[PDB]
DNA sequence: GGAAGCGAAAGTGTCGCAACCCGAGAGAGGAACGATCTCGGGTTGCGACACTTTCGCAACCCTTAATACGTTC
């Protein structure tokens, strides 16, 4: 059902897009970004095919998200997040640990079951394809690591 | 995740030393042998340290990226 979600908005066949789909996880460029002070940031961007399956999937499946999440949000930035903060005197800042990298499909599926607000429902055969769409295979010897990116 | 080379951390084995034991031997006193002291070889326990093993730092960026200027993750 995806595989067909997604063919008809790419407008491409069923066949096509379950082909591609087979190796996805590796469809993945890696490089490094300059650090402001010294080092390097390692980055993977997905290849064309694959990025406009996965947003493709991101129009087609919306998935809910809080209104204290300021990041990655239409109409919404850096400002609306401090401002939130500048009328108060006292602050804290915390952070995540490895936070891209440490979601996995476990993590995701465990998400969708666990959501307070509707989620869309996947077919248990819609799953893996899924997997493959969203998620990173860093390393190939490993097929059973995936995580985002 | 983890190349290749490297060293930290921790456990095990080796080995040289010191203390001790033992029998041999030259021979003090004056005839009756063998008092006392030292040589030389061996055994044992100890502990410092050499050897051995394991872990873990982080190269590389996988065929597979885009390129108007900034900011954030």
Known sequence: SVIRGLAAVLRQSDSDISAFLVTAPRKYKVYKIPKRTTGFRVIAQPAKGLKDIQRAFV????????????????????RDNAAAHAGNQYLLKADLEDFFNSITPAIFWRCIEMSSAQTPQFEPQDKLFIEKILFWQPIKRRKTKLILS
């Open 59 to 78: 129009q087609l499946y919306s998935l809910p998200v809080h209104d204290a999440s300021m990041a990655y949000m239409k109409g919404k930035g850096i």
